[model samples]
Target chain A: SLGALPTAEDIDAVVLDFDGTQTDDRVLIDSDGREFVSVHRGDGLGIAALRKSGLTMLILSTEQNPVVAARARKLKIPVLHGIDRKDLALKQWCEEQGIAPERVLYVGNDVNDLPCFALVGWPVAVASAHDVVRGAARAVTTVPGGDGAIREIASWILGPSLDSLDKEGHHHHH
Target chain B: SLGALPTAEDIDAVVLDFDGTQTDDRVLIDSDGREFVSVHRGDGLGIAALRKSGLTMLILSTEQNPVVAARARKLKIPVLHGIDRKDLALKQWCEEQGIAPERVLYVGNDVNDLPCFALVGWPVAVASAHDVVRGAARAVTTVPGGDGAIREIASWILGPSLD
Candidate 1:
């Protein structure tokens, strides 16, 4: 009974929480104090689709991890790391862009995302999100984090409308 | 310049910060541990107008001040006090009502309101707000806190539309 999935027209920007939302919850540490996280390959297509729609995409992380920056570079999206208070940072960013918080969509999978979730117009949780986040989310993905979750979201936003697709046959002449 | 003011259609609810926003930021403490705060008279009419428009209105406060409760009772509005984290409180309230956070408007004048301000569709600040709050506010009021500030906001929300 939720109304409908949020479409591109309903959002001006998409803010993603990197750790559990973009990457798997697992964190691998080498003997040299280096850290690595796993990300789904299919997420690239999702990112591209969101970009094609002309929506601003950003990754916000709590830790000062170089992995976030590197991923951001690969995806060509801006990233803000070592953020202690995501709500404040997000609000400031939106203000600078003249975008209202209500026009933003935030996806996360942890309690840390509760504040950011509250700040955005649409709050989404991955299938593997914490109970608190899942409870707070307006929408929950069918796929787990870093495993086509973003793709699921992208499809929801960029998919053709039923009405438009239905009228296509009428316009075409054999 | 900033865009035009928000209308009733743009908002589904209005969340107000108590102490500094509804009161004059002045606290009268007695030797016997009693506290009192001053409130603007015209704010009642503004509250009534918003209620008449069928918009959900709520007062969120950090402290458990009796004055806030008394004023809310007088105005017939709901009040939530002793909130450590306003972001969570506001979000939970909206969810309970099945309302989205983006459809709500929040007004405040201090650092405490920063979190709540970030959570709403519209963030309003009074003339007497702190510098940081003013910088984050989408709309600024000409009137100072507890001096028809809410009235100014009400007019903006219910005012005539340009188009």
Candidate 2:
């Protein structure tokens, strides 16, 4: 790999992919005909912890469904759903918030998000990320997609101490 | 009169009241009739940083205005504005999200939000909070309401490392 890039301390906001990063990338229908399969508990906790840290978090998901909104609502965070051009929409959203492009950290696992991966400050790729994405990412997490891989990336960016606060549930700003 | 109580764990969410929490409990109108004044930058950054920690965040404000929505939108966090009953909304939102009431934390500074303050997992009061709220709070922050009190409370619950 190329020499290690600059430290990620400056990242102020994170834009994440949902399909392979959160969900297992497979839709599971339960015995009762209810649909299931979402982000793992570990990853969910990671997101919750990050929200606590005061990071501006947003989900950039290709899927256009209320389930995504439901989950984001539960977490009290924002999500940009049904994004056809992921990178453009990301740029627009960031601009609206007055966030600089360099302050953003974007993560994805598939080819659709390549534009964003190439543009963001810290471009992350899941273990099972598409070959194109792996080539583009600044860091490739060892944990596979949908199995706490995003957690690995999220924790690293936030650092061990922040993660500890998450575990203790004591780290909260009024 | 009570010694500072140790901070508690299991604080999964942080709910805050607006108006007096960030303002001087006054509404200012400009020459053009536009209102503005007194929002602490440090407090905003503190809240922003805490969001990175991944704790669920919500703004429970009695004020009904574009100002509140503008701030919430900028923060990219959900807010319940102009709410007459804070406790009912908080409970309903938590229940809808599958979050337990015991796992959620709440901060209030005036008499209006006592019901919510009494019910949340960690009831926090700003130093400037009304005497009644100060008594009900599990912990009272050093910063006064509407000044950097929110930042102080957040710093404590999120731990020193978060700063």
Candidate 3:
């Protein structure tokens, strides 16, 4: 059986994790030391819509290399990265922005994001997420990050038609 | 049953199509006309190993845009794009390079690549490939282009363990 999806009113803000959440969690480097990561085109499509959906957006990352900077720039969203204590950053930022932590949708793929998940109202996991993470998620997606997981999440709020239906047609599975 | 995979001696060179063959066939556009397509990082990992494995690589595309150029540059391999008749270019190039068409592996996802498939020894279809293209392929990938399809293919030629 699948889990439940959140309604638009359920989340007042969106929080995203870097690495496996927006990418396949792989890196490519050139001889000259330039690094590149593969991100899903569908993510951009979804995030663009998500931005216009009027939900405030924030990207929380632990990577210190500023890889999320370009991606954040692409999404035109603010990011708090190089954070070893993500939960601390999330909590402090939530209070600072006047955004309720319990009313935020925190999307993640690994144990690192678990702390933030516990503090958010909607804890979402992508399909390829770790077993422990998936077990903790309130809602899950059918696709991995670089393959439209965000796009699927956006559908839950904007295009429910794309969500999967269980046999009873009552629950939407990840 | 799934089709058979190729052995080392089955092909001498590889020809790849752009767009869906390397990407998920989707594009993201900024407020400006700047466009970006999603490609699999695994493909880069695969191509890097394939280069060391000594297989000649080439990217053939029909899109007039230079999108493929940067990709080819990243792979450090040559690409011939902006050509409408990919089969013709492939045939002429094969003859010039002394690489036999009968020993070439052509990977594609669209009908436009059918001609090149007919001219090559092996034709590979990605998981999300068009039905017609899949029907004509000698082997089908289990993963889509932007999700380790090329990495999976490289396993057939080099690190079978990676698959």
Across all models, the iRMS values in order are: 16.5, 18.8, 6.3
Q: Give the top-scoring candidate (TM-score).
A: 3
Between candidates 1 and 2, the lDDT winner: 1
List the lowest-lDDT window of 10 residues for candidate 3 chain A.
A26-35
**Global lDDT of model 3:** 0.81
Q: If scored against the real structure, what TM-score would every candidate get?
A: 0.49, 0.47, 0.56
lDDT of 1 by residue, B42-161 (tens): 787888888888899999988887888999999899999987888899999999988888888898988888888777877777767764565356566667798988988888877622
For candidate 3, the docking band is incorrect
Q: In candidate 1, which residue pairs clash?
A: none
| Two-chain DockQ for each candidate model | 0.02, 0.02, 0.05
Q: Model 3, retained fraction of real contacts? A: 0.05
lDDT of 2 by residue, B1-163 (tens): 3645434366678787776565434333321223333567767877886688787899887555567777777777789987756677888888888887777778776555666765676787778665556877888878876688767766776766554
Q: Local distance difference test, per candidate?
A: 0.79, 0.69, 0.81
Provide the TM-score of the second chain in candidate 1: 0.94
Best by DockQ: 3
User: Residue by residue across A1-174, what tens digits does model 2's lDDT show?
Assistant: 463532346677878887777755666455875444445434654676677667789988777655666656645689899877888998898899888878787878899988887678778888888898988888888777666665566557655433433443332234
Say which prediction, candidate 2 or candidate 3, comes out ahead on lDDT.
Answer: 3
List ranges where model 2 is wrong by over 4 Å: A1-8, A30-34, A161-174, B1-163
Model 1 Cα displacement at B40 (Å)?
58
